[PDB]
Design a protein around this ligand. Structure first.
Ligand SMILES: CCO/N=C/c1ccc(OCCCCCN2CCN(c3ccncc3)C2=O)cc1
Ligand SMILES: CCO/N=C/c1ccc(OCCCCCN2CCN(c3ccncc3)C2=O)cc1
Ligand code: NA
Ligand code: NA
Ligand code: NA
Lengths: 58, 242, 245, 297, 49, 242, 49, 99, 58, 48
């Protein structure tokens, strides 16, 4: 609608689909989030990536 | 006014209800969000990160707690002796409780997917050896010997330049999801057993220690998911927190 | 080709012939603060080569009974070289870091160190043992400087949390039979674009033996662990007189 | 204008943080591909080097012969909003009649949710969090009774005068937001925005709030970050005479529109105080159950 | 005033009127008065089968 | 009627709720609005107007109150002596309380932006002099001497035809917004200090006063904004207003 | 708020009323339904046996 | 002396960097500042009392009897506005009775 | 809608976006205002304007 | 700790038996005459 963009997630990488009846968007529901994931950020943060088939150290 | 009629549920406060509530500060705009490293989006991202599995969960006095993080291997008498065993059930009391996977797992009623345990050998470079790591699916009792364990899913690990090996505990279940297993009728959801045996022997030359340790790291595979959000079994508070 | 490496920055170069790759924390390289993330209006000073270089600050002796140690960043450097001077003369500071922990032994020694970076590493006390006393850690324990500090209860990281899960943080292991060093690159981590290098420690560096050091009588018994680190993309603002705390 | 070569070819000032990884859509668990036997030299998936710091990249397909499985198990319940957008107890306020604490018919609650273990342990899994929230206020007598009593709740941000009595002039509430509700009405409920001066709240702050000598008597302020102190929540029975009944107000918080950064190890020792991670040194317990031997269940 | 809480298998069952489990930070709970109309909710198909 | 169900919040009166209420006078039309000068649209418009800063906030008896509006300068002994000091914190107890900026500031929890103080010299036309006005960002203690103050942001003011000079207190903060600073943990939001020193000396010829005054005027820059509406710390009433 | 007026029936619990109720587990997805023999759709199918 | 405020800006007094400021000015509009309900009047209807022991009362519509609200509006000389009035009634102890 | 224009701000320099359910517009919500500002009216009401770079009196 | 503040190399023993320390030309003058004790120490190169 024509409301204030004051939600905590305004300008986030994932888009939400919410409901609201007030002029402030932080009053909105939690809604549905976008299902993106990035495991590598934590599970594989190596500079030079190695294959599954290869010997990790050579 | 417009004709309406109140239905059951009226006035109730459901803690998980996702509704709309009046805002207390009209026209308020939050501090912009700068870039911060390491944002997480799904708990599943964390379930794929290996954390230390306390296979050796026996010592309990404060000064010996660190010993739970690693277990030993040493020169044997070649009778394919047993090194260690543990249940593969990730949401059950035991070794998995030390892992982040086990803990996050505690906030969900059901889980599904394959797991993986990577073992890192920390003995000297001059030490060699071959171990047999086996996963026994449900129904099979603790293998009495190596010949029995060998009949299940297993890996034969050879010590060398690559310090570690990974045992995959493939999802082999009758149901699409398992609830947390425990003694009693819920053992219906047990995942199985993992046993480690000496395939050959821990061999070392003159001058190197006769005992070394293995550190186990565990996490979930990419087909792993969890469902039915619940409270964890622990509540870390005795009286009131002041 | 993954075991060999050279790190050159400023007038300093590090070499290693037994590396285990390099970890780039949270998957991102250090960078300068953008014009939209920034808030302070003065033009910053970015000294470059005189502060973004390797500093070798401390050496600890690894023993069969060692418990582990920790250092706080940027605390370890606040009194060293041109970096320290800039941190003292300026209110605002930000930078990334390249951490290189060194430890070599012999093909007959064994043991494994877990080397990790834990942001906002808040220290707790044992609460008088019984947990009824609301004690607090002293300044020398929260910001130990270059000498670092030894962990009292490594199992709970002196903060009521399991070291078994510390691997959820950027880390590497120094497993003597495999490598002789750990290299971790960390970007600036904070909820603000700049902050005080004196009042706030962005993260702590933990070096803890998980598999104890061992060797036979006759092998060199003195096995040092040396800490070398380099600031990356250092920026300073809010200039005035030098202040040490 | 520039001219010396080292300045021209400089990277000083690059504000774009190069990222080594990127997010991919993942609405369901990964599928399993058919795999067959492999008897190769050179190819070795099972062997890893944990020292590197990465987790194993070995998959089911390469460790055993697998069938094809079309996995449509959802990953929706493990999103941050799914995990956190469930209301839990974070505060409790007592308004007794003849008592030790608040025998004056009003009370000031410092807005800090770390006094309750269930909620605290969940949020402390992350270092930084940014979110809006829905607060619900459940009031009743100590026996759970509902009585015809009118209350006033007022949010007092840092710097606003805190009421010092049931009749304080501050209850005029000309600018602070207040809620007037009866115990007989359903629980009061409102939406709260993200109010920190920082881009995110942080459950851990390794530092001090001010400069100077950090001597013994000031060590109570280690770890205290004002960016986390949102103010006071004040409540009073609306009247000039003492209320006839003793009241209890339970405060529930439901986060929504959540973002979190930097995950950390989860608390494994009982909590003792709100302001810090202190643990009882004489009762350091293992993270989980234990057994008599490593070779027995 | 009453509190109803759904405790899935594995979650701690309250053992008293003052059990810490009533903090209900993750389990779904319903708070309702006897004077309010009957509480009412929708439940999905939850079996592992 | 149409099926509805009441949710929590029902019946509550939230003072900042922006809803619709039944009109008491149907078809009533207000008196037209004629043109009136000086309409204001945003409080920020007022924050940019300079008001007198009571740097000399020491006299307290009724007959000396006017002396708080100005502070003195006079012939010295050239040792770069200190003239005056004050905290730059605009929403803190002290000199800024005399300014309209400080007062409006009291109705908001957080603020952000640069400030400016313009000093007007009111000595005789024959008086000359050079002053050093410095702003010391957070962390720097009160400068012991002029050489220490000089290391921060500063202006060297030369008396002359232009009676005044402006010291800009640039926004130099770690956070995007500052809450009101005060003793205690909230000093985390302190803005800093302002100190005035004799750069050379107040010089005058025979026949002109040896003491003159400076009037300080303060306001906010155009990057200044405030957020999180709150009640002011003062309530100007003792008992009931009759 | 929007002008409304409550009508008779308000607050009643009719056991056969087919209405909407708040869901207790948001974003919960049930176990997929595999194929199972002998599904019945109408009791009339059984009356013919 | 001219009567205007200084036109000197950060940029000309010190060397500044570029800052993209997206801090909102919305909360300082007149409606944001004033559209928050505050106490402006109080009426007593006692039983056996000095003032209104007759079960009725006349309140002169004047909001200047309360300092918080009064100080805010007195920042301006002339004001034109609509308003929402809310009436909260209860006994002196905060009790609700069927009256 | 088709309501009376009896709001206190009818014919104002700034436009509002409000909600209402009655025939009288003063019953409407406060809404969102337009963010215009004119500091000069109070901070710089001089007849002959001087520059920043110039000497104010010459 | 003092030496470490200058130009340096951290050498790791291994397969490559050797390491090279470069003593980069860092002088005030374009050329240096032979340094020796006395005023000619003005041309000293430094220490290793
Ligand atoms: C009419 C009044 O209604 N207003 C109710 C209200 C409720 C909540 C509210 O603010 C709630 C902010 C919750 C933030 C909790 N946080 C932020 C981080 N933090 C924290 C605590 C201890 N250590 C570090 C951080 C916290 O405890 C303001 C008003
Ligand atoms: C069914 C009855 O409901 N009607 C309620 C009602 C409430 C308010 C109302 O009029 C409120 C007008 C408020 C105007 C206040 N003002 C205007 C300026 N003013 C003032 C006071 C003292 N000195 C100068 C001006 C004021 O006190 C009329 C009816
Ligand atoms: Na509401
Ligand atoms: Na109404
Ligand atoms: Na319902």
């Amino acid at each position: 609608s024509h409301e204030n963009s004051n939600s905590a997630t305004e300008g986030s990488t994932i888009n939400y689909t919410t409901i609201n009846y007030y002029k402030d968007s932080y009053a909105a529901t939690a809604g549905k989030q976008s299902l993106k994931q990035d495991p590598d950020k934590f599970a594989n943060p190596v500079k030079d990536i190695f294959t599954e088939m290869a010997a990790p150290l050579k | 006014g417009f004709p309406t009629e109140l239905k059951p549920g009226t006035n109730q406060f459901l803690t998980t209800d996702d509704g709309v509530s009046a805002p207390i500060l009209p026209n308020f705009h939050p501090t912009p969000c700068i870039h911060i490293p390491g944002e997480v989006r799904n708990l599943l991202e964390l379930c794929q990160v290996e954390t230390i599995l306390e296979v050796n969960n026996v010592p309990t006095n404060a000064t010996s707690l660190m010993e739970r993080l690693r277990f030993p291997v040493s020169a044997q008498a070649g009778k394919g002796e047993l090194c260690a065993v543990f249940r593969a059930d990730p949401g059950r009391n035991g070794p998995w409780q030390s892992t982040l996977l086990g803990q996050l797992c505690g906030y969900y009623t059901q889980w599904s997917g394959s797991l993986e345990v990577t073992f890192m050998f920390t003995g000297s470079f001059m030490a060699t050896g071959k171990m047999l790591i086996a996963y026994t699916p449900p129904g099979g009792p603790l293998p009495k010997d190596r010949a029995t364990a060998m009949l299940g899913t297993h890996v034969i690990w050879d010590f060398g330049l690559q310090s570690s090996v990974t045992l995959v505990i493939p999802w082999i279940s009758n149901t699409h999801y398992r609830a947390h297993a425990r003694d009693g009728v819920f053992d219906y959801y047990t995942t199985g057993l993992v046993s480690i045996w000496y395939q050959t022997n821990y061999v070392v030359p003159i001058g190197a220690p006769n005992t070394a340790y293995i550190i186990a790291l565990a996490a979930a595979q990419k087909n792993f998911t969890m469902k039915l959000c619940k409270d964890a079994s622990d509540i870390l508070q005795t009286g009131t927190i002041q | 080709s993954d075991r060999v490496a050279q790190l050159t920055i400023g007038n300093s170069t590090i070499t290693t012939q037994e590396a285990a790759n390099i970890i780039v924390g949270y998957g991102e390289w250090p960078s300068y603060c953008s014009d939209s993330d920034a808030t302070a209006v003065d033009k910053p000073t970015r000294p470059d080569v005189s502060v973004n270089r390797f500093y070798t600050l401390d050496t600890k002796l690894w023993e069969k009974s060692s418990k582990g140690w920790y250092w706080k960043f940027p605390d370890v450097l606040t009194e060293t070289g041109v970096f320290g001077q800039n941190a003292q003369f300026h209110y605002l500071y930000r930078s990334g870091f390249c951490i290189h922990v060194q430890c070599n032994a012999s093909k007959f020694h064994q043991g494994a160190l877990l080397v990790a970076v834990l942001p906002e590493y808040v220290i707790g006390t044992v609460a008088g043992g019984t947990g009824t006393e609301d004690t607090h850690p002293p300044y020398k324990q929260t910001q130990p400087g270059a000498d670092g500090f030894e962990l009292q209860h490594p199992y709970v990281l002196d903060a009521g949390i399991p070291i078994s899960q510390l691997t959820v943080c950027p880390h590497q292991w120094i497993n003597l039979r495999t490598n002789n060093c750990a290299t971790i690159i960390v970007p600036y981590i904070n909820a603000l674009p700049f902050d005080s290098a004196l009042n706030h420690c962005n993260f702590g560096l933990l070096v803890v033996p998980i598999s104890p050091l061992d060797y036979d009588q006759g092998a060199t018994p003195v096995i040092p662990i040396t800490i070398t680190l380099a600031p990356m993309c250092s920026e300073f603002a809010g200039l005035r007189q030098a202040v040490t705390q | 204008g520039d001219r010396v070569a080292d300045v021209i070819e400089s990277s000083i000032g690059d504000s774009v943080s190069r990222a080594l990884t990127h997010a991919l859509p993942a609405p369901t668990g990964q599928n399993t591909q058919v795999s067959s036997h492999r008897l190769d030299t050179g190819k070795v998936p099972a062997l890893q080097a944990a020292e590197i710091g990465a987790s194993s990249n070995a998959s089911d397909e390469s460790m055993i012969e697998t069938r094809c499985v079309l996995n449509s198990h959802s990953t929706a319940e493990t999103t941050l909003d799914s995990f956190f957008s469930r209301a839990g107890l974070v505060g409790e306020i007592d308004l007794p009649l003849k008592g030790t604490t608040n025998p004056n018919g009003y009370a000031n609650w410092d807005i800090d949710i770390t006094g309750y273990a269930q909620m605290r342990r969940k949020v402390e899994l992350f270092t930084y969090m940014r979110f809006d929230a829905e607060f619900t206020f459940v009031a009743c007598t100590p026996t759970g009774e509902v009585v015809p009593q009118l209350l006033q709740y007022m949010f007092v941000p840092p710097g606003a005068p805190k009421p010092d009595s049931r009749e304080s002039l501050a209850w005029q509430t000309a600018t602070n937001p207040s809620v007037f509700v009866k115990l007989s009405d359903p629980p009061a409920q409102v939406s709260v925005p993200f109010m920190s001066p920082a881009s995110a709240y942080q459950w851990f702050y390794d530092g001090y709030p001010t400069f100077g000598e950090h001597k013994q008597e000031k060590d109570l302020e280690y770890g205290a970050c004002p960016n986390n102190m949102m103010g006071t929540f004040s409540v009073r029975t609306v009247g000039t005479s003492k209320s006839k009944y003793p009241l209890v107000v339970r405060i529930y918080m439901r986060m929504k529109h959540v973002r979190a950064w930097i995950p950390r190890p989860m608390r494994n020792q009982n909590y003792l105080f709100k302001a810090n991670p202190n643990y009882a040194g004489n009762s350091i317990k293992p993270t989980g159950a234990s057994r008599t031997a490593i070779t027995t269940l």
